[PDB]
Amino acid sequence: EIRGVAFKELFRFADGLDYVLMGIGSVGAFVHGCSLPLFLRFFADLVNSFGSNSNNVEKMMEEVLKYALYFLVVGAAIWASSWAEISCWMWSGERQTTKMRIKYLEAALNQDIQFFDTEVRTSDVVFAINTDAVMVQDAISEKLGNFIHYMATFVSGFIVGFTAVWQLALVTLAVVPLIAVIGGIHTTTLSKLSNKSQESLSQAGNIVEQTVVQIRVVMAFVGESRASQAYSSALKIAQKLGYKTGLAKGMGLGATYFVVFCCYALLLWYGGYLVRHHLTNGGLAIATMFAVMIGGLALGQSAPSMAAFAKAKVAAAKIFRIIDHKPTIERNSESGVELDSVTGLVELKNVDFSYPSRPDVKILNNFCLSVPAGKTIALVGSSGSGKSTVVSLIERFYDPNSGQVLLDGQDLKTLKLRWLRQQIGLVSQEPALFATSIKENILLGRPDADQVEIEEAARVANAHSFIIKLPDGFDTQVGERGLQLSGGQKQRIAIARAMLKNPAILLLDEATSALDSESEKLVQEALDRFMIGRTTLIIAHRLSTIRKADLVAVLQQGSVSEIGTHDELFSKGENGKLAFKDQANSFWRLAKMNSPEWKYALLGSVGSVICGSLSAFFAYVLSAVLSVYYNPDHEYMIKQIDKYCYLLIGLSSAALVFNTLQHSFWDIVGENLTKRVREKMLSAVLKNEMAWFDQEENESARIAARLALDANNVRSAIGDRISVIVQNTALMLVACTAGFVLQWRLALVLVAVFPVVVAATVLQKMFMTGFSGDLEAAHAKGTQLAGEAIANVRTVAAFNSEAKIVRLYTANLEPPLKRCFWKGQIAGSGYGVAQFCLYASYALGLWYASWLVKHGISDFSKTIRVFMVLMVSANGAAETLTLAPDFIKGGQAMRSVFELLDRKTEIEPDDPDTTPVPDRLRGEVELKHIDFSYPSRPDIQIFRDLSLRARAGKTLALVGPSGCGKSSVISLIQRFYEPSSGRVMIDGKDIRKYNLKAIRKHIAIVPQEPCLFGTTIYENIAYGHECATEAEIIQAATLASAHKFISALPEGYKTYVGERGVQLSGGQKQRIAIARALVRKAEIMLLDEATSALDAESERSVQEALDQACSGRTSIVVAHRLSTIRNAHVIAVIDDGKVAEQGS
Ligand SMILES: Nc1ncnc2c1ncn2[C@@H]1O[C@H](COP(=O)(O)OP(=O)(O)NP(=O)(O)O)[C@@H](O)[C@H]1O
Ligand SMILES: Nc1ncnc2c1ncn2[C@@H]1O[C@H](COP(=O)(O)OP(=O)(O)NP(=O)(O)O)[C@@H](O)[C@H]1O
Ligand SMILES: [Mg+2]
Ligand SMILES: [Mg+2]
């Protein structure tokens, strides 16, 4: 594929309206970006007029009113600009993306079939559908507007700073790289530590996933405690990594604060020096500092836009590669050579063909079907022969490279390729129902049909009664959630589609796994005896279909050299309000669980409060310094500025130390809690019935994924997020008290407009994040329909329904387009209103301060201090409200955690109060009057009044047929399942009233699937007995005729084994499992299909090994072949849950 396209190529699908929208959005973004430095300049001018005219109250009042009106104007401009930018950019991006998706799907469906074999795969095409969102609905939708906005902010801030005071602007410009470098180092270290911690968490998740997968053996052989120990060790490694990550984050933030405070101290001293020499005034100095800092931050904030631009260039290069490719069928489908009377004579002629994917091999050979016109052919040959290949050749999916295939004496290469597919009606292995309605699914076979025609096609051919008995009635949306799998009924629908097409020659490929739904009724309906020409390719083990066709024309080896009418069945065969109180109780319970380290939290909280206070003090200092700038006494101003700079240096050191302290302690408690929670979740999971594991929702991978997610999110919400809330509350209190002390009433007016500022700042944070949600989730219906169409491209092209699919795609994509337009309008209007109210609040507060000064109630210094302090308070409160949704999510996750932990188990693995057991049992087992319905199928009851009996030390060899009991017995003898009314007697004792684990220490399991653990075979053998050492390993496979091959391995015992290890043979791993069972040294032995997948010598050796093992101990054996089990005391037979002859 191309490396990338030009940035200007992203706007290929932009029309005039899109150009107008982009122009308006660019203008709005530029004005919105430039507004903030203009606000800083106007604030500086207001402060100058407010502090430089203490003697002249009239002039200062007039100028303060003037600049408050300027603030209102800036607020209105921000409102208009933000509205225009957000709405126009979102809507134009959505429109261009929708057009691009429509044309991409059209081009992909118009492509030739072989294009999906040699060129990009189907999975690549659906991935392109999915990633089109993050490409175009992201780069040109909001990232471009953000880039323009941030360039405007950076340029305007630099211009304002260098036009107000150029010396201070240069100093701040020198300052900015220091903070940039500190932030970059902090982010790099944090990302590295996060990667390491994620790797450790992935290892722990793998451990829990394997435990849940092999819970079959993890419970049978006690050792779920060992799984808990392994999980604890992995979590301890992850906990050390988390401690390192938290310490790194704390040091990074502390260094950032230290550098910021020291640099601002130097800047304030230099500003005082400049004010002394009458080069400037205090307001312009502060505005210059803030404007240059804002410009630097804006320049920093445009990097994600560039990253999105690069990713979009790559993905758009891929999409344009797919779009611009010219299909092969376009020149194949040429001027009208359609006939006027089809007879149904398909002659394959001498043609051979090879797939372009693997041209070396010739799948097709020298043969010709020569389908008789008006008569049915039914070819049955091999499983890997060109049956589906010749089917595709008939429909001209692939152009033959040798010879030619012709219809009614006319070459297929010369036909319409549209009319041709109109004659042939195809039935495939997969019905391939689309996301649209059932009636639309029927209609896409023939677009020029109405409801009566659909009803007659469904009724006369096949049936339609199943459609009526549907929740949605006559018309139903099958989709992916509206309806579920209907089995052969889905196939039924396909047949109906084939019956909406005009009656002609048909290609009916397969009806496998349809039961009676669409085999007998399929051959009865669909005019399998009527019409002209058919090709029934179904094998179905020769389900009487051969007699239907006049000729068989077998396809052995890939040829029809054997053809005619006969009874030769052997056709060769070469191949084949929500509950907040519950949430609060959950927090109380979790914190009670987190008691053993409450002390840590307190110390963290202490750091928390300090940090909050420090922030407040910083604000105060700035305001104080600003006030000191407007003082005629030069020496007094020098002394005050020096004092404030020294205090700021001290504050920087304290901020570094205490910020590191708070982050370290809160991350410590957070990591410890999330670890304790994970251990508790695993311990509760491993103490559940197998039926609980049977639960579909309790999938091994899902069980692991759910655990990880709930653990991490609750951890974050309770540990990292809280520190923020506490420090922000500290800031609020100190800021509030300082304001009402320096100047009350003004602070009261400020706290009155507090919610307005909080809302405006939280909307600013949301704007920084982005005002468009999950774009992939917005186009879910469209993307799943497109994926279904692309995966089934052969069926789409067979029915000539590309245009119908494209128009359905447009119909599915329109509602998201309208929703995006309205969402953009609402978001822009709300953001603009919030910003306008914010600036109105600023103007009102400043004007009230000026009025208070005029009336002699207060002074410039106190009013300015209260103002700045309260504004930083509002910023902190807005940050807290921004972080609150994470607390909501954490509450949901911890509710899930607590409902999992509080779940009770009916079969408790350990019973502290139970009957004691002798060290050595007797070995007798009595399964008396047992019966139960497997939890998977409660409707299907298994076993009726079974009376199985195994004597002390004797061998039982129950066999049965496949699927009738067998394993179920060993799933009940050892309490994997609960009989409805059964009795299990062991050593003259019922097992229900017993400790369970105590006998399961004396039971050995060798299931059908030879499960293996970890990476070394030695530990796999040792799993049977936790104190195996090496002598029992001699008593292991060493003494079970399974030592030669393991010694032949390069590493011997410590040989890499497992899913990621060496894939051993079935017999070798089976005797590994046998060795594990011997190491268990169980008094009661349970064999389970030990002679199923072994070679002759391996089967023999396993036979003597098991015969030696069973000596003197009761054993239950199941095996299909009776020759191995004839040398047993008793043999039992079961069938359909009933008890057959058992004595012999
Ligand atoms: N695009 C392809 N490229 C390469 N090999 C393919 C391709 N499609 C199918 N094959 C293989 O070609 C061989 C011939 O089988 P084919 O006639 O394609 O289907 P089939 O096995 O007859 N299907 P079915 O009738 O359902 O049992 C098989 O090994 C296929 O897996
Ligand atoms: N994991 C399972 N989920 C659902 N049903 C099950 C499961 N395991 C066993 N059954 C049912 O238990 C009954 C008896 O199956 P069973 O004979 O134990 O199977 P098997 O061990 O796979 N047989 P075989 O392959 O001949 O050794 C059948 O109704 C099965 O469908
Ligand atoms: Mg086929
Ligand atoms: Mg089995």
Side-chain angles (χ1 to χ4, degrees), residues 1-10 309-321:
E1 85 280 354
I2 312 179
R3 188 187 311 282
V5 299
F7 182 66
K8 60 185 284 181
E9 272 308 313
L10 285 172
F309 293 163
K311 295 162 51 186
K313 284 167 58 172
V314 173
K318 292 154 56 176
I319 287 179
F320 290 168
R321 182 258 317 266

Side-chain angles (χ1 to χ4, degrees), residues 785-838:
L785 169 70
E788 272 170 22
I790 296 287
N792 301 116
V793 58
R794 46 197 62 249
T795 75
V796 166
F799 289 106
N800 261 339
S801 63
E802 299 97 305
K804 165 68 61 185
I805 293 299
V806 167
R807 84 178 44 113
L808 289 191
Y809 194 44
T810 69
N812 285 241
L813 284 195
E814 171 96 14
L817 175 82
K818 292 308 291 175
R819 185 105 171 150
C820 172
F821 165 79
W822 281 121
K823 185 190 202 306
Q825 281 301 325
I826 292 306
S829 176
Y831 184 80
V833 164
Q835 301 324 110
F836 177 76
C837 284
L838 166 68

Side-chain angles (χ1 to χ4, degrees), residues 387-389 391 429 509-510 537:
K387 311 183 308 309
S388 299
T389 305
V391 163
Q429 172 82 235
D509 201 70
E510 279 320 316
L537 188 153

Side-chain angles (χ1 to χ4, degrees), residues 849-865:
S850 83
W851 182 92
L852 281 184
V853 166
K854 192 199 86 69
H855 274 54
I857 291 181
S858 188
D859 198 5
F860 167 58
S861 65
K862 313 177 183 57
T863 45
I864 208 73
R865 289 208 270 275

Side-chain angles (χ1 to χ4, degrees), residues 843-1144:
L844 168 71
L846 272 183
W847 170 89
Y848 190 60
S850 83
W851 182 92
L852 281 184
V853 166
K854 192 199 86 69
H855 274 54
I857 291 181
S858 188
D859 198 5
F860 167 58
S861 65
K862 313 177 183 57
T863 45
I864 208 73
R865 289 208 270 275
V866 171
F867 185 74
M868 321 275 268
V869 161
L870 266 297
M871 311 286 79
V872 311
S873 181
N875 278 359
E879 273 189 6
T880 298
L881 273 189
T882 288
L883 265 70
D886 285 10
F887 273 80
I888 308 314
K889 189 186 47 202
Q892 188 274 331
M894 65 180 288
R895 209 182 59 249
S896 165
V897 163
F898 273 118
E899 70 88 20
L900 176 53
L901 273 69
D902 291 331
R903 200 266 193 193
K904 271 263 170 293
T905 184
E906 57 264 18
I907 312 175
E908 48 166 356
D910 183 9
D911 199 353
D913 186 59
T914 181
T915 185
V917 56
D919 44 0
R920 186 56 54 242
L921 283 72
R922 188 172 40 181
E924 64 92 19
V925 179
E926 303 292 302
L927 262 58
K928 302 314 288 174
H929 308 336
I930 63 170
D931 59 356
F932 80 116
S933 63
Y934 206 113
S936 64
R937 285 84 180 118
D939 34 59
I940 304 180
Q941 185 201 1
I942 308 188
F943 290 122
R944 288 94 174 92
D945 200 355
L946 183 63
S947 295
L948 199 70
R949 51 169 191 113
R951 321 279 81 180
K954 306 306 299 163
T955 69
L956 193 146
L958 68 91
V959 61
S962 72
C964 310
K966 302 189 309 301
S967 297
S968 290
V969 178
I970 62 170
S971 281
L972 171 153
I973 188 156
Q974 63 154 20
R975 290 287 286 288
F976 267 58
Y977 281 110
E978 189 49 48
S980 58
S981 76
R983 298 304 311 284
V984 193
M985 191 85 158
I986 298 196
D987 201 355
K989 174 212 51 183
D990 168 56
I991 198 166
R992 291 300 313 290
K993 45 189 62 181
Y994 182 88
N995 194 244
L996 181 136
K997 286 184 180 180
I999 314 184
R1000 297 172 76 182
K1001 295 292 183 182
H1002 304 68
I1003 314 286
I1005 298 314
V1006 290
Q1008 293 83 16
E1009 317 314 298
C1011 54
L1012 271 299
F1013 276 109
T1015 179
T1016 72
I1017 295 90
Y1018 163 64
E1019 76 182 24
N1020 303 153
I1021 317 303
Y1023 204 110
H1025 200 48
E1026 73 272 40
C1027 295
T1029 74
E1030 293 293 328
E1032 279 74 7
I1033 310 297
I1034 306 301
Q1035 306 298 316
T1038 311
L1039 278 185
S1041 79
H1043 189 294
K1044 185 264 290 181
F1045 70 100
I1046 177 163
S1047 53
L1049 286 169
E1051 306 92 349
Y1053 295 157
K1054 277 85 72 173
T1055 298
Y1056 191 16
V1057 70
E1059 303 283 335
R1060 263 71 53 90
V1062 174
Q1063 287 69 240
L1064 265 69
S1065 86
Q1068 289 161 331
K1069 70 172 70 143
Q1070 277 199 7
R1071 43 192 155 270
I1072 297 169
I1074 297 169
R1076 178 169 55 189
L1078 276 296
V1079 176
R1080 176 50 70 107
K1081 206 182 298 311
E1083 176 167 13
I1084 296 189
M1085 181 67 187
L1086 305 185
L1087 280 296
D1088 182 50
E1089 300 304 81
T1091 59
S1092 50
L1094 301 96
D1095 63 84
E1097 201 56 278
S1098 71
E1099 197 272 335
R1100 274 319 319 151
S1101 303
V1102 166
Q1103 271 305 136
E1104 292 84 4
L1106 294 174
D1107 294 323
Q1108 290 176 349
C1110 295
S1111 308
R1113 304 190 282 98
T1114 303
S1115 58
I1116 318 304
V1117 191
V1118 305
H1120 300 298
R1121 58 180 294 164
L1122 57 88
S1123 64
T1124 65
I1125 69 192
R1126 63 189 175 181
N1127 300 113
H1129 187 193
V1130 72
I1131 179 154
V1133 189
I1134 52 186
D1135 44 352
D1136 213 30
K1138 209 162 298 300
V1139 190
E1141 294 179 353
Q1142 196 262 330
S1144 184

